Amino acid sequence: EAVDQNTAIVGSTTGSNYYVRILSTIDRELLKPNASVALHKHSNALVDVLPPEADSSIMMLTSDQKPDVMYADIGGMDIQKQEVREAVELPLTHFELYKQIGIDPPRGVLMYGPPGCGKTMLAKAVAHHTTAAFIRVVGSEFVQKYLGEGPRMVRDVFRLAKENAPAIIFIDEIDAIATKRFDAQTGADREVQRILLELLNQMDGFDQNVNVKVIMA
Amino acid sequence: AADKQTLQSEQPLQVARCTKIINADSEDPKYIINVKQFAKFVVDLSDQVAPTDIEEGMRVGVDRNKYQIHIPLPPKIDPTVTYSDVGGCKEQIEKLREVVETPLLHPERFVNLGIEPPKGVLLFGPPGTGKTLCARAVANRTDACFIRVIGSELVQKYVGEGARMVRELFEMARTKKACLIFFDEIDAIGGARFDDGAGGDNEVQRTMLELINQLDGFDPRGNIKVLMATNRPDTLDPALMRPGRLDRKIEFSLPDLEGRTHIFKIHARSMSVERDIRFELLARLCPNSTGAEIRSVCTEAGMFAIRARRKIATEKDFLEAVNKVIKSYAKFSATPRYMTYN
């Protein structure tokens, strides 16, 4: 927070909190959130402010690690393939075919089937075809020690997501981290509770322009 | 300002950080210290101290700049440690008479027959049964002496502090003749050497080793006897089940009926009742109970004797006392209320 003209309060990554005289260099409104700011080693004063931060631990693979798979490269997933195309790529260009009919933008999706139907293969191909910023994570690293840790992971993904674009961002896990059993005080209940409440409370029903189709399977 | 000038002379005289001792090397002082919070350290001393008294389980003076050892003391001390009716259980005091009284009376039956004197007992029985009474009922005949020690009194948060109180109890034991420390809850004191790669509840471990050391072996006991109480001979050590230490295992359990009549005598005579009443009917009304609960019964007949102004307890006072405790306070009131029987 800021007390007055060009003098403010910053916490730090050193552990404690400080109250600092800040320069006239940074524009007087660039300090609304707890934004990534720069201080001095010795004498602790603001020099610059960086608005984004916090990549998602691999950050989208960035270049090439799309497994190079086409539509017909998939052997036989035609309803899942075809409908994912209908609900991913056709919305991505034709926002207005959803306007002259008047329908909705998209959200996540659910898959199922026996182990060995090429379950990640569709995600491989749709990552290959697209243009967007395919941020991926996986599920079973969500179960972690500190308070709201995986919840902080989900919000890092969402804040970075809304920072980039409503482009396409991806998660692939449903099973055994988010079962429907809310009601058991049986182990890691802080973690089970924060995962379930995080999934629902960041689901929110909608965010409406972000993170196209978290595919769960 | 009664000493203010000398306080302006102690400003160049200041040393000795707290720094509890973990352990040492051999052949040399070479001790090992954690401070409190930071780290660990393998230390060596300043020269003008005694390397003798820097033993394990202690917190020494330590320099700021060189961490060299300065004078210890015990900086963790003193708040650390919190018979006419001889005749309770019957077959027990006689084995008590044996294992305590017969070494403390004659080395005639023992050394001449070629046996060692039985010095320790493993009591076992449910709680509320009179381990405390028989323990202290030893101390009519010895001289007068007794000390009582619960096991979980030694749950204090420093290494060897419990071992330091083992030092304290064994060096108070030899000061006095024919004395009785009592032990209880000897499971948390430790009989089983549970270990995997954790390094946790180890003050118990080294305290238990200190217990085996000072207990039996290396100048044995003499005119000191100590009873150990439990519900189990199951969670002990085979190093005090070393067959010449704790070898009797006096048994008792819930009293029969007549034991409860005797406890009725005991907690009838020591309070304000009338001397015209019986107790065997009450003894029938207590199929499974303890003499501690007989104390509760007598104090509850005293509660009825408070309710009305009664110092001469009727039979009805103890009737409604037992009816209170075993049927109207066992859980609420309503396990009876059907005939089917009478």
Binding site: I9, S16, Y18, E86, Y98, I101, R155, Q202 | -
Partner: protein, 327 residues
């Protein structure tokens, strides 16, 4: 600009004063640290020491130097979380007696505090709008308390249930400082620091309130079986459920989510609402979207009724399955 060697000594931090005492000393308890008693500067008073107001402690000799406003500061961290200005009344259609209950519990303390305070007590504080999550409950509550426009600032109060609540929260009453300095606002929550925060709610909302009850609301799912130390009737006054919406409400929401579409004349919506089994709020919207998807795969601009019926066949079948009527 030459003054900026003043920068070069002191990041003189925010100080934490419980209260002052006599003899020109205070009690500063520094931000992750302990009690350090010191002397004060000359340009602020012992009189200027407000109870639990932060100060600007220089760290030269811990000279108590300046006193700083804004009084808590995890505060705007929560005040920069609410920020959902949603839509209007006409896309609600059917929980209308619940809207009149929302009138009774919310809008009358907005309009007339002393027509319930003329009765002699405080006002109700919650409705516990439980049910299947997402019947438009967001849409309902956020819209109807959106049009009051200045008396509902939906904190959401539990999004980091482990980090907003206790990990920076004093005794989460930064929320209550918000409730008092934004006296027209409303607190919205989800689900033992939660239990401690319940106990400070009970320190406040048990008849000890500045700005009238404010309006603390949580709505749970899956079965109302949280820990029952919250569930005494003198902890949450009213309790309102959300039934599955009926043929009238499905018809009304069907007109709602069909209106904006490119419409074909000659349709019967009641038929579609009769086919629906009373699902929880907006499978109306599911049928509308999947009929738009059938129009998307095909190429049309008129959305006839048979397209909606194919979407009914998509998102109404399973549940299905007969040779099972028995009962």
């Amino acid at each position: 600009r030459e003054e900026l060697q003043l920068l070069q000594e002191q990041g003189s931090y925010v100080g934490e004063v419980v209260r002052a005492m006599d003899k020109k000393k205070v009690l500063v308890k520094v931000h992750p640290e302990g009690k350090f008693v010191v002397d004060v500067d000359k340009n602020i008073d012992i009189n200027d020491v407000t109870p639990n107001c932060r100060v600007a402690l220089r760290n030269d000799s811990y000279t108590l130097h300046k006193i700083l406003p804004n009084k808590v500061d995890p505060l705007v961290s929560l005040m920069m979380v609410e920020k959902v200005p949603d839509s209007t009344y006409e896309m609600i259609g059917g929980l209308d007696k619940q809207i009149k209950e929302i009138k009774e519990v919310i809008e009358l303390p907005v309009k007339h505090p002393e027509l319930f305070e003329a009765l002699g007590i405080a006002q109700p504080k919650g409705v516990l709008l439980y049910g299947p999550p997402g019947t438009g409950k967001t849409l309902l509550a956020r819209a109807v308390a959106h049009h009051t426009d200045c008396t509902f600032i939906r904190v959401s109060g539990s999004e980091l249930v482990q980090k907003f609540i206790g990990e920076g929260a004093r005794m989460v009453r930064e929320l209550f400082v918000m409730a008092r300095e934004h006296a027209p606002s409303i607190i919205f929550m989800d689900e033992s620091e939660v239990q401690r925060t319940m106990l400070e709610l009970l320190n406040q909302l048990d008849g000890f309130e500045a700005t009238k009850n404010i309006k603390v609301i949580m709505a749970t799912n899956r079965i109302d079986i949280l820990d029952s130390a919250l569930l005494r009737p003198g902890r949450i006054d009213r309790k309102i459920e959300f039934p599955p919406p009926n043929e009238e409400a499905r018809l009304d929401i069907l007109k709602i989510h069909s209106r904006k579409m490119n419409l074909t004349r000659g349709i019967n919506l009641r038929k579609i609402a009769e086919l629906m089994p009373g699902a929880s709020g907006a499978e109306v919207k599911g049928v509308c979207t999947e009929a738009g998807m059938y129009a998307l795969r095909e190429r049309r601009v008129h959305v006839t009724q048979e397209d909606f019926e194919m979407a009914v066949a998509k998102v109404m079948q399973k549940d299905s399955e007969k040779n099972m009527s028995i009962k």
